[PDB]
Amino acid sequence: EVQLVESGGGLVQPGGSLRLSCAASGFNVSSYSIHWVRQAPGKGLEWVASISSYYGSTSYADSVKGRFTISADTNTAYLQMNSLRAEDTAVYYCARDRVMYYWSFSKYGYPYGMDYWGQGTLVTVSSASTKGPSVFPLAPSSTAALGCLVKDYFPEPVTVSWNSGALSGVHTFPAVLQSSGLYSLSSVVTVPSSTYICNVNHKPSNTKVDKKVEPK
Amino acid sequence: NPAIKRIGNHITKSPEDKREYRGLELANGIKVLLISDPTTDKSSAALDVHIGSLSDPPNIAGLSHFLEHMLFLGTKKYPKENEYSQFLSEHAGSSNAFTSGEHTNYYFDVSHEHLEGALDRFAQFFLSPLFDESAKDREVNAVDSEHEKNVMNDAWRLFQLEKATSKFGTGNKYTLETRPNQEGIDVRQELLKFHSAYYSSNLMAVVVLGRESLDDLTNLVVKLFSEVENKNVPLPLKQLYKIVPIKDIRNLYVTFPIPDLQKYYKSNPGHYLGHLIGHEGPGSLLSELKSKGWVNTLVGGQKEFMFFIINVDLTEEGLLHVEDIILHMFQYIQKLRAEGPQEWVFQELKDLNAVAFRFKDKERPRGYTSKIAGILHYYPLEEVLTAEYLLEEFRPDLIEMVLDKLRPENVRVAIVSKSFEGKTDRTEEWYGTQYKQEAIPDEVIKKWQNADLNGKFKLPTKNEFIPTNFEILPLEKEATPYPALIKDTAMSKLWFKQDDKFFLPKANLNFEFFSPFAYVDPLHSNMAYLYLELLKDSLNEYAYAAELAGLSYDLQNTIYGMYLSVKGYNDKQPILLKKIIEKMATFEIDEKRFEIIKEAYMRSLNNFRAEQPHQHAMYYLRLLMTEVAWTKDELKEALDDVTLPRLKAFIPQLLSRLHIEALLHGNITKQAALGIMQMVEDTLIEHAHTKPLLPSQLVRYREVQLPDRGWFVYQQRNEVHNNSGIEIYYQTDMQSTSENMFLELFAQIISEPAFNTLRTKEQLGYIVFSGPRRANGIQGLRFIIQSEKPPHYLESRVEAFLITMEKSIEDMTEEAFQKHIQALAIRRLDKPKKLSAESAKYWGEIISQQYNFDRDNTEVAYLKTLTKEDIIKFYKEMLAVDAPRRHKVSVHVLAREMDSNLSQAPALPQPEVIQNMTEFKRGLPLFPLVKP
Amino acid sequence: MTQSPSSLSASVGDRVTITCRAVSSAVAWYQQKPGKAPKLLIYSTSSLYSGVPSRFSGSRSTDFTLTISSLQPEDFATYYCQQSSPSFLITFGQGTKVEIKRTVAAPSVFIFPPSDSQLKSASVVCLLNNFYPREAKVQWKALSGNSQESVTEQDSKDSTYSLSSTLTLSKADYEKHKVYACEVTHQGLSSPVTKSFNR
Ligand SMILES: [Zn+2]
C-alpha cells in the first residue's frame, strides 16, 4: 500500500532553517520523481521544487532559488529550507510521479499526474513570543447578535465555545494575521431577544478564559 | 505450498493459441513458465542463467563459455559422457546452448513421451557436474575449433574490434589453457569457483513445454528445480575506424551508446526510433542515400549498456562520401527532433504489433522455450507472452530522451573497405584484424551538430497496406488432403489447396516461371539474375510498407527460370502481386542502378573464395553431380559482356515464351485461385506478349551416374581459411519406396554414433555431418566434415566408422532395431507446425515433379516391415569397401597452409583423380529422370 | 497559466465546466477538498486517473476543460489545472471553487463598538449574519487601507455565508472622530444599507 509521510515541520524564527522529510513507503524513491508543493494560508496551490533521483536532476521555483535544496536518500526525499522568510509560512505537501523514470531534461513538457500525495506538514515562520490570548466582548444594537473577540494570541490554534460548549447560530470566523505577527478572530452568535458566557481556549500556551456579554 | 512463492495462473495469450500456460516462482527464487500442448510432437525445455561472459575473471578470458561446455560432460547420477545426448538422439531429440554477454542459455527438445527423462538428466547439470579431467583437455580443443572456424569471418572481427576498443568472451586454447598454466592458475578450481559463485537459483529462469497437463508439468519442475541453491547474488568517443575485411565488402557502421532500454518495454522507444530511422519507404534516409548512388542497403535500430546503430553498404561512389552520408543521417535525425514525437505513429506501431501477435505463427518448440526462458528475467510472469509485442503507454518523453543520445558528440564510426589495405598501422590482438584509428576533426563534428533541414526527408505516411479483413473462408465441401491440380494448360499448371489446419487469415502464392533462355549459357544466367536484382531494387520503396504490414515476397533466379513467392495476409495480397508481375513485364532499366548492381554482383561472385571449406565441398559436389552447372568463375568472366542494350533486349525475349507452375495455398477459394492465376496470365500476355512453351522444351537436368566399384576424388585449395573440408558421397540409385527407406533407416541408425565417435571421441573437427543427399531424382549417403586433420585421414576414419557400424548393426537386438525404426517413423510423420512449412513440403513435391504427396505414409508403412537382414545386405551391396556396387566420390578442400586405440581402417584402393570436371562428366552415363 | 472561473456555483446534479488556458500542449487535473491534500483526477488531458468517478471528463476546445456532468454533493471542492513545462517546471492555476447553490439570502447586518478594556491597552467590527452569494462589498466611513475581513465556509444546512469586518485604529484616532459607519453592498439589498453608530 503506497503512501507518503512528511516530517520536520515546526515553528522557526525567520531567517532560520528546517529540513522536511517525505518518508516514502511502498515504492523506491530512486526511480520515481518527488515533487514539493506548498499551499499558502487561504491561497492557491503553489509548486516549490522537484527531484528526479535517477537522472539526478533537481528543479526549483523562481520564488526560492538560493534558499532551498531538494535532495533524496535511497528511502526518503528531503526538502531543505535555508533562511526562511516570514512569507514561507505555509503547508507543504510532497507527491510522486504516477509514471516511472520521467525524463527531466525536456523540450515539450508532458503533464503526467501525481497519484500519491502526502497530507502535508505546516511550517509556521514568525519571530514572536508565544502569547496567552486576549478576550474582548461585543455589545448589541438596541434578532440579537453578540459574541467575543480574541485579538492577540500565538500560535494557532484556539477553540471558542459558548457556555462550556452548551450552545446553533454559532459562527466562529477564520483567524487573520495581525500586521504584528499575531492572530485574531471573532466568534458571533445570533440569539432571541428574551446571559451568555463564552470560553476562549488556547492550548499551545496553557490558557482558558471565560467572559460574559451584556446588552447596551 | 512452501515451495512456491506465488502462482500467477492467468497468462495473457493470443486467442488463436490453444496451448496452456502457468507461471510460478519457486521458493529458491526461480521463475518458471509451464506450457501444455496436447497436440505437440516434440517437447522442449530451456534454462537461462542471468550470467554470461561479462562476468569472466580478468585472468581467464572465455571462462563462462568453457563452463557452458563443461556442464554437459557428466554428472553423479549419470556418469556416461554422452548419456544425455545419446538419450536425446535415441528419442528424436537434440540440444544446444549459447553464451551471450549477460545470459547463458541451455535448451533441448525430445520426443514428447520422454520429456521427464530428458528433464531429469538435464536437471543434473545444475546439481552436480563431474567436470571430468579428460573431458577438459579435449573440450578446450572443441572451444578452440569453434573460434578457429570464426577467425576469418568478417562479422566476428568487427564484433571484437568494437568491443576491444573489452574482454574476449569466446576463449581459445591460449586463454583457457596456455596462459593459465604459465601463471600458476588451476582452471578446474576456477570453474568450480565460478559455478559456485554465479550459478545461483535466483538468477535462473526455466520454461518447459510438453504434452502433460499443467499439474504434471508443475510437479516435474517443482521436483527437479526446488533444490537449486539461492545465494542472493547481486546482478553485476568521436572515434573513426578504418578496417580491412577478408571478403571484398564495403560497409559503414555508425553507433551511439545509449542506456539500457530493456525496462522501457511498455513503450519500446528504441523500436520506435529504429522503425523511423530504419524505414525504406518514400521520403526516407535510405531513399535519399540510394538516389544519391551512395548506398544499397540500410539497417537501423537497437543492438545489445546498449547501442543504437545505423549501418549501410557502400557503392564505389559512397566510399568516398562517408562524411556526407553521415551528414544526411544527422539531418534526418534533426528532422525527427524538429517534428517531435508522433502519437499517430505510435498508434500504428501498437496496432501492427497487436495484429501480428493475434495471428503470430506457431513457433518451433525449441525456439519458443529458449526465447521465453531468456526473457523471463525481465518481465512479470503474466506478461512474458505479450511483453515483446504489446505496447501500452505512449511515452514521448522516453522517445525524446533516446533521441537526445543520437548526437554527433557521442558517435562512433567504422568503415570497412579493401581500399585501406596497406594504409593501416594497428593490429587487433585476438583475430589479427588490421585497422587504423583516427579522431574525427572537430570541424566535421561541428558541421554535423548543425545538420540542417533538407525537406527531402519526410516522415513516412499512413501504411495503406494494413489488412482489415480477417474472415476465414469456410472449408470447401469437396476439400482434399493433398493439393489438387485445378488447371492444366499449355501456359500454366495450377496446384491449389485451401488451408484445413492452421486457420490464420494468410496465404502463400508460389510461382515458378520456366524459360530455357534463363540458363542456356553463363551470359544469360547473369542477365536473368541482374534483371531480377534490378526489379527488386526498383520495387523496394513500394514493397516496404507491405512488408511491415505482414506481406512479403521473394523473387530469385533458378536453374529453371524464375521463382516468386508472396506470403502473408491475403486481404491485400493480389494488389502486391499485380504490381510485381505488371512491373516484371514492363520493366525499364535505370542505367546508374544497372552499373551499381552489376558491380555488387561482381563482388559477390568474387566473395565465394571466403566461404567455409564445407560450403565449398557442397558446391563442387553439386557441380560434379549435375549434368549442367555454371561455375561462379565462369559467371564472373561472362559478366563483362553484359551491357545495357543486351539486357534491354534480353528481357522481352526471356518473357516471350514461358510455362508457369504455381502452388496457391492458404485462406483462399478455388474461384479466387483461378482468379489470381488468370490475372497473372492475362497481365503477362498483355505486356510481354507471352505465348506457351512446347511440352518438349521442359528440360530437367539429370545426374551423372557413377560406375560400379569406382572411387573418384576432386581436390581444390581454399585460399582464405586455414582449415580443410571434405565431402564424401556414396551414390546409391534412383528414388523409390524401398531404396529410400533403406538409405533413410541407415542414416538414422548411423546418425548419432557418428557424432559421438568422429567428433566427441576422435575430435576430427567441429563440423561433422551425415545423411541422405537427394538431387535430380537420385540419392545417396553423404558425409561432410571440416577439420584441422588432412583429408586422406578423414577418409580413412570415415571408412573405419562405416565398418564399425556394419558390425554394430549385425550385433544389435530386435528391440533396439525397432527403436531405430520407431524413431525414423516419428521423424518422418512429423506434421508441419505452421503454414509455410507445409507449403515448403508441397513445393518440394512439385518442383521435383515427383508429386508424391502421400509419400510419408507409404514410406513409413513400408518402413515398419523392414528387418536387420535387409539393411545388412543393402549395406553389403552398396556401401561396404568391397561392395560390387560402390559409387564413391570425394571432394577435398585443402587448408590454405595444407599440403597436396582407434578402430581399424580398411585398406583402400587408389582413387581416380578428377583433373577437369567437364571431362569427368562427358565420360560417364546419366541417370533417368524420376517418373511423375 | 490561467483558469476560469474564480469559482462556480450550482445545484447537485447540475453540469459544471471549468476552463484552464495554457511547448506543452496538454494539461492535468486535481480535486482538492478544503484542508486535505490534492487528489488526482485526470492526467492525459483526455483520460482519467484510476478509481475516479466516470463523471469527470477532460476535454479541449486552445483552452482545456474539466467537466463534471453529474455533480454529486461531495464534489464541492476547489479544482486545479496543472501544467508541466520544459526545464523541469510545474505550475498550477488560481483554483476553481465549486460552491453549492441555494437561492438569494439577505445579510443581517450588525455593528460592534470597541470594548472599554481594549482602549486601556481599538477595533470596531461589522458583521454580516447570513447571505448568498459570497459576493458582497463593505466599506467603512471618509474611507480605507486599514480594514481586515474574514469570511466563513458555507453553512452545513442553509449554505449561506457570514462575513466579518474589522476596522482597527489606535485609540487616539478613535476619539479624533465621532461618526462611524458601515456600508454593505449585496444582491438582496434594495438600498445599500449603511449602519452608522455614534459616540
Ligand atoms: Zn561453444
Side-chain angles (χ1 to χ4, degrees), chain C residues 61-94:
Chain C
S61 321
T62 322
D63 69 315
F64 304 61
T65 100
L66 171 47
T67 285
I68 321 179
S69 175
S70 282
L71 155 54
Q72 291 305 314
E74 284 73 42
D75 292 340
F76 293 104
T78 321
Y79 283 100
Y80 298 103
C81 63
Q82 158 221 298
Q83 194 88 234
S84 195
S85 70
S87 184
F88 220 24
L89 291 183
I90 291 243
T91 8
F92 294 82
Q94 82 282 348

XYZ file of all heavy atoms in Angstrom, chain C residues 61-94:
269
model
N -11.135 22.463 -26.349
C -11.811 23.204 -27.399
C -10.858 24.173 -28.077
O -10.982 24.454 -29.267
C -12.991 23.970 -26.791
O -13.660 23.195 -25.808
N -6.119 24.821 -27.927
C -6.767 26.051 -27.491
C -6.749 26.085 -25.961
O -5.695 26.185 -25.335
C -8.240 26.134 -27.982
O -8.354 25.594 -29.305
C -8.777 27.572 -27.946
N -7.943 26.014 -25.384
C -8.195 26.037 -23.950
C -8.441 24.589 -23.540
O -8.797 23.771 -24.384
C -9.389 26.932 -23.614
C -10.709 26.357 -24.093
O -10.775 25.886 -25.250
O -11.687 26.392 -23.314
N -8.282 24.259 -22.264
C -8.521 22.881 -21.845
C -9.697 22.991 -20.897
O -9.911 24.036 -20.300
C -7.310 22.273 -21.125
C -6.023 22.319 -21.915
C -5.458 23.520 -22.315
C -5.425 21.146 -22.328
C -4.287 23.543 -23.049
C -4.266 21.160 -23.067
C -3.694 22.360 -23.430
N -10.501 21.934 -20.793
C -11.685 21.996 -19.936
C -12.116 20.730 -19.198
O -12.400 19.696 -19.804
C -12.940 22.456 -20.756
O -13.732 21.315 -21.101
C -12.585 23.217 -22.031
N -12.125 20.832 -17.871
C -12.546 19.755 -16.987
C -14.065 19.838 -16.899
O -14.622 20.935 -16.791
C -11.957 19.938 -15.589
C -12.442 19.018 -14.460
C -12.459 17.554 -14.879
C -11.644 19.224 -13.184
N -14.735 18.689 -16.927
C -16.193 18.679 -16.877
C -16.759 17.644 -15.906
O -16.345 16.475 -15.875
C -16.799 18.444 -18.284
O -16.682 19.643 -19.059
C -18.272 18.075 -18.197
N -17.702 18.143 -15.108
C -18.449 17.437 -14.078
C -19.899 17.444 -14.550
O -20.578 18.459 -14.423
C -18.348 18.105 -12.696
C -16.932 18.648 -12.454
C -18.804 17.152 -11.598
C -16.769 19.333 -11.118
N -20.373 16.329 -15.099
C -21.753 16.254 -15.560
C -22.784 15.980 -14.466
O -23.721 16.751 -14.317
C -21.847 15.070 -16.524
O -23.189 14.859 -16.934
N -22.594 14.884 -13.733
C -23.491 14.511 -12.632
C -22.925 14.898 -11.272
O -22.847 14.047 -10.375
C -23.767 12.995 -12.675
O -24.730 12.678 -13.671
N -22.620 16.177 -11.109
C -22.061 16.674 -9.846
C -22.899 16.256 -8.624
O -24.072 16.552 -8.493
C -22.009 18.226 -9.902
C -22.028 19.118 -8.655
C -20.934 18.762 -7.647
C -21.992 20.611 -8.994
N -22.192 15.534 -7.762
C -22.705 14.989 -6.506
C -22.655 15.992 -5.346
O -22.281 17.144 -5.539
C -21.913 13.727 -6.170
C -22.199 12.573 -7.112
C -23.679 12.244 -7.184
O -24.358 12.160 -6.158
N -24.190 12.064 -8.393
N -23.025 15.566 -4.128
C -22.939 16.552 -3.047
C -21.552 16.547 -2.399
O -21.273 17.376 -1.533
C -24.024 16.108 -2.062
C -24.908 15.204 -2.840
C -23.997 14.509 -3.791
N -20.693 15.628 -2.833
C -19.354 15.520 -2.274
C -18.293 15.872 -3.312
O -17.117 15.556 -3.141
C -19.093 14.106 -1.741
C -19.773 13.780 -0.410
C -21.277 13.586 -0.534
O -21.719 12.941 -1.509
O -22.014 14.067 0.353
N -18.726 16.484 -4.409
C -17.797 17.025 -5.395
C -17.726 18.552 -5.311
O -17.449 19.222 -6.304
C -18.193 16.589 -6.804
C -17.999 15.103 -7.027
O -17.225 14.488 -6.260
O -18.617 14.550 -7.962
N -17.981 19.098 -4.126
C -17.883 20.539 -3.902
C -16.547 20.872 -3.248
O -16.404 20.845 -2.024
C -19.049 21.034 -3.047
C -20.382 20.934 -3.737
C -21.286 19.940 -3.413
C -20.729 21.849 -4.721
C -22.516 19.865 -4.062
C -21.951 21.775 -5.370
C -22.844 20.782 -5.041
N -15.574 21.180 -4.098
C -14.196 21.415 -3.689
C -13.547 22.433 -4.624
O -14.223 23.046 -5.449
C -13.427 20.112 -3.712
N -12.239 22.621 -4.484
C -11.500 23.543 -5.337
C -10.832 22.692 -6.404
O -10.387 21.581 -6.125
C -10.443 24.265 -4.506
O -10.984 24.583 -3.218
C -10.003 25.541 -5.205
N -10.750 23.207 -7.626
C -10.176 22.429 -8.720
C -8.936 23.070 -9.329
O -8.947 24.239 -9.705
C -11.241 22.208 -9.786
C -12.208 21.132 -9.363
C -13.446 21.464 -8.833
C -11.873 19.792 -9.450
C -14.329 20.495 -8.423
C -12.753 18.817 -9.038
C -13.975 19.174 -8.526
O -14.850 18.200 -8.118
N -7.874 22.278 -9.448
C -6.618 22.752 -10.016
C -6.189 22.061 -11.311
O -6.191 20.841 -11.431
C -5.497 22.602 -8.983
C -5.712 23.430 -7.736
C -6.148 22.837 -6.562
C -5.498 24.803 -7.736
C -6.357 23.580 -5.422
C -5.716 25.559 -6.597
C -6.145 24.939 -5.442
O -6.344 25.672 -4.292
N -5.823 22.903 -12.265
C -5.375 22.563 -13.605
C -3.879 22.728 -13.513
O -3.392 23.783 -13.115
C -5.958 23.554 -14.610
S -5.499 25.283 -14.464
N -3.121 21.687 -13.814
C -1.691 21.871 -13.719
C -1.033 21.637 -15.052
O -1.542 20.950 -15.931
C -1.113 20.851 -12.713
C 0.386 20.534 -12.847
C 0.716 19.055 -12.673
O 0.477 18.473 -11.621
N 1.252 18.441 -13.722
N 0.148 22.220 -15.145
C 0.992 22.150 -16.287
C 2.343 21.667 -15.840
O 2.776 21.878 -14.688
C 1.143 23.545 -16.898
C 1.728 23.570 -18.294
C 0.663 23.425 -19.358
O 0.747 22.553 -20.224
N -0.354 24.281 -19.298
N 3.031 21.124 -16.828
C 4.377 20.632 -16.727
C 5.022 21.042 -18.030
O 4.516 20.770 -19.119
C 4.509 19.130 -16.433
O 5.823 18.804 -16.024
N 6.143 21.720 -17.887
C 6.678 22.587 -18.914
C 8.121 22.195 -19.090
O 8.559 21.260 -18.420
C 6.305 24.063 -18.711
O 6.985 24.606 -17.590
N 8.844 22.848 -20.022
C 10.266 22.499 -20.086
C 10.984 22.806 -18.771
O 10.344 23.317 -17.851
C 10.768 23.065 -21.416
C 9.653 23.981 -21.855
C 8.368 23.380 -21.323
N 12.272 22.482 -18.705
C 13.180 22.921 -17.644
C 12.974 22.247 -16.275
O 13.425 22.753 -15.248
C 13.210 24.454 -17.546
O 14.160 24.879 -16.584
N 12.269 21.114 -16.289
C 11.562 20.546 -15.129
C 10.611 21.433 -14.304
O 10.695 21.425 -13.079
C 12.595 19.925 -14.180
C 12.163 18.628 -13.559
C 11.212 17.827 -14.169
C 12.713 18.211 -12.356
C 10.820 16.628 -13.585
C 12.326 17.017 -11.767
C 11.380 16.223 -12.382
N 9.707 22.181 -14.931
C 8.866 23.080 -14.141
C 7.385 22.675 -14.131
O 6.823 22.177 -15.107
C 8.978 24.360 -14.961
C 10.347 25.038 -14.949
C 10.305 26.338 -15.731
C 10.799 25.283 -13.519
N 6.793 22.927 -12.966
C 5.441 22.577 -12.520
C 4.695 23.915 -12.384
O 5.336 24.931 -12.112
C 5.424 21.699 -11.257
C 5.973 20.306 -11.585
C 4.014 21.572 -10.704
C 4.975 19.169 -11.398
N 3.370 23.934 -12.542
C 2.612 25.192 -12.410
C 1.127 24.893 -12.349
O 0.609 24.104 -13.112
C 2.824 26.086 -13.646
O 3.540 25.365 -14.654
C 3.602 27.342 -13.274
N 0.442 25.550 -11.414
C -0.970 25.305 -11.186
C -1.748 26.588 -11.412
O -1.164 27.646 -11.628
C -1.152 24.952 -9.705
C -0.520 23.659 -9.274
C 0.834 23.620 -8.977
C -1.274 22.517 -9.078
C 1.433 22.458 -8.545
C -0.675 21.344 -8.645
C 0.680 21.317 -8.380
N -3.073 26.498 -11.349
C -3.913 27.656 -11.585
C -4.331 28.270 -10.267
O -3.951 27.778 -9.204
N -5.132 29.329 -10.321
C -5.534 30.005 -9.098
C -6.639 29.244 -8.384
O -7.015 29.598 -7.266
C -6.067 31.394 -9.448
C -7.514 31.429 -9.901
C -7.686 30.987 -11.335
O -6.712 30.860 -12.079
N -8.931 30.752 -11.735
